[PDB]
Coordinates of C-alpha atoms and ligand atoms in Angstrom, one line a residue:
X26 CA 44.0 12.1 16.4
X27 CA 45.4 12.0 19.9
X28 CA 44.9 13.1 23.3
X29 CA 47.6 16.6 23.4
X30 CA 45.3 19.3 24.3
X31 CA 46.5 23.1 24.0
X32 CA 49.3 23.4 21.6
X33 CA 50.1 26.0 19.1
X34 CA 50.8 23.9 15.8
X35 CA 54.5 25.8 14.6
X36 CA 54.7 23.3 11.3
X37 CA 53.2 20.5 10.0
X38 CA 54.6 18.2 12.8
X39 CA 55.7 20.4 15.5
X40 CA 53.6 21.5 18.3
X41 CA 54.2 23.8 21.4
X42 CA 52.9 24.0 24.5
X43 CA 53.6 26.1 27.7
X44 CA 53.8 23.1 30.5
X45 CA 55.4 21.4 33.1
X46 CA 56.2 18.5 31.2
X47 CA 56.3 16.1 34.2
X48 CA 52.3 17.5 34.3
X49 CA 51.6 16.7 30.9
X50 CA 53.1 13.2 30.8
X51 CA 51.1 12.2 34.0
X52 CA 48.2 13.6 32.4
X53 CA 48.8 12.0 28.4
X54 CA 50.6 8.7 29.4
X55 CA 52.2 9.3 25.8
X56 CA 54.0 6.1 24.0
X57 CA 57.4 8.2 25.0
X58 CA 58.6 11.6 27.0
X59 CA 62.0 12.3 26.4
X60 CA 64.3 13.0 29.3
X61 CA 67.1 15.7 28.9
X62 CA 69.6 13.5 30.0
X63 CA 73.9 13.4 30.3
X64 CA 75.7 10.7 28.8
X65 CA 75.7 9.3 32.7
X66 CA 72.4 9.1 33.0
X67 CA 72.6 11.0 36.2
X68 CA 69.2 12.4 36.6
X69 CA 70.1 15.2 38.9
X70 CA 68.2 19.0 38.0
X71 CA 66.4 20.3 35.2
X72 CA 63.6 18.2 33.2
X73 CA 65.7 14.8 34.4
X74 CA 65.9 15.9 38.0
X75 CA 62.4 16.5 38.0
X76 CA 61.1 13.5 35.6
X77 CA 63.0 11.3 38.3
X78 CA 61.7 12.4 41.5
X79 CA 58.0 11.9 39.7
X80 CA 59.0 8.1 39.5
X81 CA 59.9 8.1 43.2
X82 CA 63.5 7.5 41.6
X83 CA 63.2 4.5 40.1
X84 CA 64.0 6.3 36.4
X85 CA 67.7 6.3 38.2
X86 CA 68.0 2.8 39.5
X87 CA 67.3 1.7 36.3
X88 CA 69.7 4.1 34.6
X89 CA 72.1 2.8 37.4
X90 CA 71.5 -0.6 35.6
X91 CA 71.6 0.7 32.0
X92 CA 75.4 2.1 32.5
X93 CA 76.6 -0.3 34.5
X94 CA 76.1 -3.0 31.4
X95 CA 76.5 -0.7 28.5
X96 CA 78.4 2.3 29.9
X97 CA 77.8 6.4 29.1
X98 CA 75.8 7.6 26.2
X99 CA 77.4 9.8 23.6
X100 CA 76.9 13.0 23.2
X101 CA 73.9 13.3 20.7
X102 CA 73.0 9.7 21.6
X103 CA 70.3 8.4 23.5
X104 CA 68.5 5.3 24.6
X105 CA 65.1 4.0 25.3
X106 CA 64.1 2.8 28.7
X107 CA 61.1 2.5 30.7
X108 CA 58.6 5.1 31.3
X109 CA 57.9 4.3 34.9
X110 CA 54.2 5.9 35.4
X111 CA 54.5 8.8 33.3
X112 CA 54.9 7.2 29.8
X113 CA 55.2 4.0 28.3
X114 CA 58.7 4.9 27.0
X115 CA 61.8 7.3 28.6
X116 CA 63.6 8.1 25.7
X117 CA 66.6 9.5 26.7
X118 CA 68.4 12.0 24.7
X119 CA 71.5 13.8 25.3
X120 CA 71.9 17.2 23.7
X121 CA 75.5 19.0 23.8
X122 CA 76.0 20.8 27.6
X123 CA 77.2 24.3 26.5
X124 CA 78.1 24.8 30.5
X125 CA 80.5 21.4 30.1
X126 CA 81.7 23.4 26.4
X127 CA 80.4 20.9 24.2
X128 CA 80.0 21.2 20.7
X129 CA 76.4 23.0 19.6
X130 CA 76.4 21.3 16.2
X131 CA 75.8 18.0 18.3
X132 CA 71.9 19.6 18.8
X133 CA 70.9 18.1 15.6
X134 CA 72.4 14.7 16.0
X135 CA 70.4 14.8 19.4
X136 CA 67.0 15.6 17.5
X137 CA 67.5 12.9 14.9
X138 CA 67.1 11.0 17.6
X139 CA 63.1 11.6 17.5
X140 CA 62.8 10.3 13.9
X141 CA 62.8 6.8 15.4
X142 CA 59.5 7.7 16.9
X143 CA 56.4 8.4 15.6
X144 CA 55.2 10.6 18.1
X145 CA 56.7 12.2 21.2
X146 CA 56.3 14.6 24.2
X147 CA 59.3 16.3 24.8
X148 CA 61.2 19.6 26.1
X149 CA 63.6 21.5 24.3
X150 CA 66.9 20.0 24.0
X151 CA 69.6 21.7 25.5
X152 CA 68.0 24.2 26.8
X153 CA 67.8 25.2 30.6
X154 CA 70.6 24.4 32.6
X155 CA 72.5 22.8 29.2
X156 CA 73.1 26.4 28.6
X157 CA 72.3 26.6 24.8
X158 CA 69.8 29.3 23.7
X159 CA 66.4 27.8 23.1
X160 CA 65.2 30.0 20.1
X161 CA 68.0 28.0 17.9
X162 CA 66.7 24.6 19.8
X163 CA 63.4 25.2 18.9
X164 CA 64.8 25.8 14.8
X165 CA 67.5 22.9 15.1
X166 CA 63.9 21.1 16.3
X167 CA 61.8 22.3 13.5
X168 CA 64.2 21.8 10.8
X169 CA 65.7 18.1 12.2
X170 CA 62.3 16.6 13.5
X171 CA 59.7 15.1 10.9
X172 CA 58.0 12.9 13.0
X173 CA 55.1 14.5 15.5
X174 CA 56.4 16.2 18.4
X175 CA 54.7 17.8 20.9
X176 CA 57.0 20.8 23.2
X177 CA 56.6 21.1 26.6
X178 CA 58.3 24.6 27.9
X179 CA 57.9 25.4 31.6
X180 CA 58.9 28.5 31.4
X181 CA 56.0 31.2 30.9
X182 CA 57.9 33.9 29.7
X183 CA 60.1 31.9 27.6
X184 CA 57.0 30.1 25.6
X185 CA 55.8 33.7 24.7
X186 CA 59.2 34.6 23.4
X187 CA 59.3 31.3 21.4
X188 CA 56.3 31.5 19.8
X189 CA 56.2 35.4 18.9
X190 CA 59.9 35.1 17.5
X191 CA 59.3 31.4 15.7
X192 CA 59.9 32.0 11.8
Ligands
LIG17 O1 60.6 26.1 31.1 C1 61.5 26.3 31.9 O2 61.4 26.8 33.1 C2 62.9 25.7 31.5 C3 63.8 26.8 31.1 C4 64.0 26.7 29.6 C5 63.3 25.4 29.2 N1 62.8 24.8 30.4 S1 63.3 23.2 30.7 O3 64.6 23.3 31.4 O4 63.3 22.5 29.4 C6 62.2 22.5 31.8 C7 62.5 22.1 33.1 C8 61.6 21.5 34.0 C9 60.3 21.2 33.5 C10 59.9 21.6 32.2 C11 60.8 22.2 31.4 N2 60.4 22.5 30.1 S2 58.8 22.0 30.2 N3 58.7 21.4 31.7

């Protein structure tokens, strides 16, 4: 048992939610959100824009940190770091950037992130301003993920759509 409230349950470990998900984090604390994030950790719109500016920036000085020892993220990659005040952890996860013309078969990699963790909060990866189309990130999710993850979608109209097309 834990302390998500609201979801639809899709499978036996994947769980959906219409949310802001900065909202639900300061409301869970969950052992890890995971950030939408670019390989530079540049946390500037979408779910990292806004993740960010709910830790009064201090998600990017330490991302500032992160790259300046280890330098960018790959595509599909992702590292753990703080969760400032809105989780314990900030896993952050790049998915493929259709707008930067980056390969869409990187989506999975990107999930298989999530198997390192038992349970997360988390948005769909690139979807929003990563330009993919979030009915096949919701099935690269589904069929990629088999630890417990819990989906955050901001969009109203788009959770409806999700759900009453999810096979
Ligand atoms: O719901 C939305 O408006 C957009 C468009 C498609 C998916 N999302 S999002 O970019 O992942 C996103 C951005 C900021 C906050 C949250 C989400 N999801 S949940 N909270």
């Amino acid at each position: 048992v834990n302390s998500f409230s609201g979801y639809l349950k899709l499978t036996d470990n994947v769980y959906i939610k219409n949310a802001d998900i900065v909202e639900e984090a300061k409301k869970v604390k969950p052992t890890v959100v995971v950030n939408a994030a670019n390989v530079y950790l540049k946390h500037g719109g979408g779910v990292a824009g806004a993740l960010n500016k709910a830790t009064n920036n201090a998600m990017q000085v330490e991302s500032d940190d992160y790259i300046a020892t280890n330098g960018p993220l790959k595509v599909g990659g992702s590292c753990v770091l703080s969760g400032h005040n809105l989780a314990k952890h900030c896993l952050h996860v790049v998915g493929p950037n259709v707008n930067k013309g980056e390969d869409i078969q990187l989506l999975k990699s990107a999930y298989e992130n999530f198997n390192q963790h038992e349970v997360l909060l988390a948005p769909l990866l690139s979807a929003g301003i990563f330009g993919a189309d979030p009915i096949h990130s919701l099935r690269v999710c589904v069929d990629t993920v088999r630890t417990n993850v819990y989906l955050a979608v901001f969009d109203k109209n788009l959770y409806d759509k999700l759900v009453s097309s999810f096979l």
